[PDB]
Amino acid sequence: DMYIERAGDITWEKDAEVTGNSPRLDVALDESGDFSLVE
Amino acid sequence: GETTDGVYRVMTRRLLGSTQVGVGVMQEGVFHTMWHVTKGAALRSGEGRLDPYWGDVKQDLVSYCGPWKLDAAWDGLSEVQLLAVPPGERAKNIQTLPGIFKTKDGDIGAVALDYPAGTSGSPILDKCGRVIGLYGNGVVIKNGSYVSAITQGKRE
Numbered sequence: 001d002m003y004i005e006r007a008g009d010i011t012w013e014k015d016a017e018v019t020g021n022s023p024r025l026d027v028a029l030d031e032s033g034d035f036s037l038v039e
Numbered sequence: 040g041e042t043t044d045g046v047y048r049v050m051t052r053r054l055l056g057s058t059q060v061g062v063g064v065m066q067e068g069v070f071h072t073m074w075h076v077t078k079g080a081a082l083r084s085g086e087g088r089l090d091p092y093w094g095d096v097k098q099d100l101v102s103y104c105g106p107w108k109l110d111a112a113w114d115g116l117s118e119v120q121l122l123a124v125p126p127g128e129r130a131k132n133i134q135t136l137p138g139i140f141k142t143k144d145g146d147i148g149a150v151a152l153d154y155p156a157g158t159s160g161s162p163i164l165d166k167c168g169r170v171i172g173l174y175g176n177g178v179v180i181k182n183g184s185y186v187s188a189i190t191q192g193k194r195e
Protein backbone atom coordinates (compact mmCIF):
# COMPACT_ATOMS: atom_id res chain seq x y z
CA ASP A 1 0.00 0.00 0.00
CA MET A 2 1.53 3.30 -1.22
CA TYR A 3 1.20 6.58 0.78
CA ILE A 4 1.97 10.28 0.28
CA GLU A 5 3.83 12.85 2.50
CA ARG A 6 3.96 16.62 1.91
CA ALA A 7 7.48 17.75 1.04
CA GLY A 8 7.04 21.49 0.31
CA ASP A 9 5.37 24.34 -1.63
CA ILE A 10 5.66 24.71 -5.40
CA THR A 11 7.62 27.99 -5.83
CA TRP A 12 10.44 29.22 -8.04
CA GLU A 13 13.51 30.21 -5.92
CA LYS A 14 15.62 33.19 -7.04
CA ASP A 15 19.38 32.49 -7.02
CA ALA A 16 19.05 28.69 -7.00
CA GLU A 17 22.01 26.37 -7.83
CA VAL A 18 22.28 26.60 -11.71
CA THR A 19 23.73 23.40 -13.25
CA GLY A 20 23.12 20.96 -16.17
CA ASN A 21 23.66 21.09 -19.94
CA SER A 22 21.09 21.43 -22.87
CA PRO A 23 21.53 18.42 -25.21
CA ARG A 24 19.70 17.99 -28.57
CA LEU A 25 18.94 14.22 -28.87
CA ASP A 26 17.16 12.09 -31.51
CA VAL A 27 14.71 9.80 -29.65
CA ALA A 28 11.78 7.37 -30.30
CA LEU A 29 8.82 6.71 -27.98
CA ASP A 30 7.37 3.18 -27.93
CA GLU A 31 3.86 1.90 -26.96
CA SER A 32 5.17 1.11 -23.43
CA GLY A 33 6.03 4.82 -22.88
CA ASP A 34 9.77 4.07 -23.09
CA PHE A 35 12.25 6.42 -24.81
CA SER A 36 15.21 5.14 -26.80
CA LEU A 37 18.16 6.78 -28.62
CA VAL A 38 17.94 6.88 -32.42
CA GLU A 39 21.23 7.13 -34.40
CA GLY B 40 -6.38 13.33 4.44
CA GLU B 41 -4.07 16.16 3.30
CA THR B 42 -5.16 17.76 0.01
CA THR B 43 -3.19 21.07 0.32
CA ASP B 44 -1.44 22.17 -2.90
CA GLY B 45 2.29 21.31 -3.07
CA VAL B 46 4.94 18.69 -3.84
CA TYR B 47 4.57 15.27 -2.14
CA ARG B 48 6.68 12.13 -1.75
CA VAL B 49 5.23 8.75 -2.83
CA MET B 50 6.39 6.10 -0.34
CA THR B 51 5.93 2.32 0.20
CA ARG B 52 6.35 -0.10 3.16
CA ARG B 53 6.36 -3.26 0.89
CA LEU B 54 10.20 -3.21 0.77
CA LEU B 55 12.68 -2.98 3.75
CA GLY B 56 11.70 0.00 5.97
CA SER B 57 9.96 2.94 4.28
CA THR B 58 11.12 3.38 0.65
CA GLN B 59 10.54 6.39 -1.65
CA VAL B 60 9.27 5.24 -5.06
CA GLY B 61 8.53 8.71 -6.47
CA VAL B 62 7.09 12.26 -6.13
CA GLY B 63 3.89 14.05 -7.22
CA VAL B 64 2.09 17.41 -7.44
CA MET B 65 -1.13 18.23 -5.57
CA GLN B 66 -3.03 20.98 -7.44
CA GLU B 67 -6.75 21.80 -7.31
CA GLY B 68 -7.56 18.64 -5.26
CA VAL B 69 -5.83 16.45 -7.90
CA PHE B 70 -2.66 14.45 -7.24
CA HIS B 71 -0.46 14.21 -10.38
CA THR B 72 2.43 11.73 -10.75
CA MET B 73 4.14 9.47 -13.35
CA TRP B 74 2.47 6.13 -14.24
CA HIS B 75 5.62 4.06 -13.56
CA VAL B 76 5.71 5.33 -9.94
CA THR B 77 2.31 3.97 -8.84
CA LYS B 78 1.37 1.66 -11.79
CA GLY B 79 -2.21 3.00 -11.37
CA ALA B 80 -2.48 1.64 -7.79
CA ALA B 81 -4.53 3.44 -5.07
CA LEU B 82 -2.72 5.82 -2.68
CA ARG B 83 -3.17 6.59 1.00
CA SER B 84 -2.92 10.09 2.59
CA GLY B 85 -3.12 9.46 6.32
CA GLU B 86 -6.57 7.94 6.89
CA GLY B 87 -7.79 8.97 3.40
CA ARG B 88 -7.73 7.09 0.09
CA LEU B 89 -6.82 8.56 -3.31
CA ASP B 90 -8.36 6.59 -6.19
CA PRO B 91 -6.96 6.89 -9.77
CA TYR B 92 -9.00 8.93 -12.24
CA TRP B 93 -7.04 9.12 -15.48
CA GLY B 94 -3.86 7.42 -16.74
CA ASP B 95 -1.88 6.50 -19.85
CA VAL B 96 1.24 4.20 -19.96
CA LYS B 97 2.55 5.90 -23.18
CA GLN B 98 2.38 9.48 -21.82
CA ASP B 99 3.62 7.81 -18.52
CA LEU B 100 1.21 9.97 -16.48
CA VAL B 101 -1.61 9.41 -13.94
CA SER B 102 -4.00 11.70 -11.96
CA TYR B 103 -5.86 10.91 -8.70
CA CYS B 104 -9.23 12.26 -7.50
CA GLY B 105 -9.82 14.12 -10.78
CA PRO B 106 -8.74 15.07 -14.26
CA TRP B 107 -5.21 16.32 -15.10
CA LYS B 108 -5.02 20.04 -14.07
CA LEU B 109 -1.45 21.00 -15.14
CA ASP B 110 -1.41 22.81 -18.50
CA ALA B 111 1.63 25.19 -18.40
CA ALA B 112 4.28 24.64 -21.10
CA TRP B 113 8.03 25.31 -21.59
CA ASP B 114 8.44 28.40 -23.80
CA GLY B 115 11.44 26.86 -25.67
CA LEU B 116 13.77 29.67 -24.56
CA SER B 117 13.87 30.23 -20.79
CA GLU B 118 15.62 28.38 -17.97
CA VAL B 119 13.48 26.23 -15.71
CA GLN B 120 13.80 24.82 -12.20
CA LEU B 121 13.49 21.16 -11.24
CA LEU B 122 11.98 21.08 -7.72
CA ALA B 123 13.82 17.83 -7.00
CA VAL B 124 12.55 15.87 -4.00
CA PRO B 125 15.24 13.12 -3.64
CA PRO B 126 14.89 10.12 -1.27
CA GLY B 127 15.76 10.96 2.37
CA GLU B 128 16.78 14.47 1.31
CA ARG B 129 14.99 17.83 1.51
CA ALA B 130 13.14 19.35 -1.50
CA LYS B 131 15.59 21.52 -3.50
CA ASN B 132 15.25 23.76 -6.59
CA ILE B 133 17.84 23.30 -9.37
CA GLN B 134 17.89 25.76 -12.28
CA THR B 135 18.92 24.54 -15.75
CA LEU B 136 18.38 25.34 -19.43
CA PRO B 137 16.51 22.48 -21.10
CA GLY B 138 17.65 20.65 -24.20
CA ILE B 139 15.43 19.04 -26.86
CA PHE B 140 14.19 15.50 -27.51
CA LYS B 141 13.53 15.41 -31.27
CA THR B 142 10.79 12.85 -32.15
CA LYS B 143 8.73 11.87 -35.27
CA ASP B 144 5.73 13.62 -33.58
CA GLY B 145 7.54 16.86 -32.64
CA ASP B 146 10.05 18.28 -30.16
CA ILE B 147 9.86 18.06 -26.36
CA GLY B 148 11.93 19.86 -23.74
CA ALA B 149 14.48 17.80 -21.82
CA VAL B 150 16.32 18.34 -18.52
CA ALA B 151 19.83 16.95 -18.00
CA LEU B 152 20.25 16.57 -14.21
CA ASP B 153 21.35 13.39 -12.34
CA TYR B 154 18.92 12.10 -9.71
CA PRO B 155 17.93 8.66 -8.35
CA ALA B 156 14.95 6.94 -10.05
CA GLY B 157 12.97 7.60 -6.80
CA THR B 158 13.03 11.34 -7.66
CA SER B 159 10.46 10.54 -10.55
CA GLY B 160 7.33 12.76 -10.48
CA SER B 161 9.21 15.88 -9.24
CA PRO B 162 7.83 18.98 -10.99
CA ILE B 163 9.60 21.23 -13.46
CA LEU B 164 8.77 24.93 -13.03
CA ASP B 165 8.67 28.09 -15.08
CA LYS B 166 9.71 31.55 -13.69
CA CYS B 167 6.04 32.03 -12.55
CA GLY B 168 6.07 28.88 -10.37
CA ARG B 169 3.75 27.00 -12.81
CA VAL B 170 4.33 23.28 -13.35
CA ILE B 171 5.36 22.86 -17.00
CA GLY B 172 5.96 19.07 -16.66
CA LEU B 173 7.24 16.17 -14.51
CA TYR B 174 10.71 14.62 -14.35
CA GLY B 175 11.29 10.87 -14.58
CA ASN B 176 10.91 9.64 -18.18
CA GLY B 177 13.77 9.86 -20.61
CA VAL B 178 16.89 8.22 -21.94
CA VAL B 179 20.35 6.93 -20.85
CA ILE B 180 23.23 8.59 -22.74
CA LYS B 181 26.85 7.39 -23.63
CA ASN B 182 27.90 8.61 -20.12
CA GLY B 183 25.50 6.22 -18.32
CA SER B 184 23.78 9.43 -17.03
CA TYR B 185 20.00 10.19 -17.39
CA VAL B 186 18.28 12.88 -19.48
CA SER B 187 14.55 13.24 -18.72
CA ALA B 188 11.85 14.74 -20.91
CA ILE B 189 9.62 17.61 -19.66
CA THR B 190 6.43 15.47 -19.53
CA GLN B 191 3.15 17.40 -19.53
CA GLY B 192 -0.45 16.13 -19.61
CA LYS B 193 -3.54 17.58 -21.27
CA ARG B 194 -6.18 19.63 -19.37
CA GLU B 195 -9.76 19.22 -20.72
Ligand SMILES: O=C(Nc1ccc2c(c1)CNC2)c1cc(F)c2[nH]ccc2c1
Pocket residue numbers: 032033034075099153154155156157158159174175176177185187
Ligand atom coordinates in the same frame (compact mmCIF):
# COMPACT_ATOMS: atom_id res chain seq x y z
O1 LIG C 1 13.66 4.18 -15.15
C1 LIG C 1 13.30 5.35 -15.02
N1 LIG C 1 12.10 5.80 -15.44
C2 LIG C 1 11.05 5.01 -15.97
C3 LIG C 1 10.85 3.72 -15.48
C4 LIG C 1 9.87 2.91 -16.03
C5 LIG C 1 9.11 3.40 -17.08
C6 LIG C 1 9.29 4.69 -17.56
C7 LIG C 1 10.29 5.50 -17.04
C8 LIG C 1 8.31 4.96 -18.66
N2 LIG C 1 7.88 3.60 -19.01
C9 LIG C 1 7.95 2.76 -17.80
C10 LIG C 1 14.24 6.36 -14.45
C11 LIG C 1 13.84 7.61 -13.93
C12 LIG C 1 14.77 8.49 -13.42
F1 LIG C 1 14.39 9.66 -12.88
C13 LIG C 1 16.11 8.13 -13.45
N3 LIG C 1 17.22 8.80 -13.03
C14 LIG C 1 18.32 8.03 -13.29
C15 LIG C 1 17.96 6.86 -13.89
C16 LIG C 1 16.53 6.90 -13.99
C17 LIG C 1 15.58 6.02 -14.49
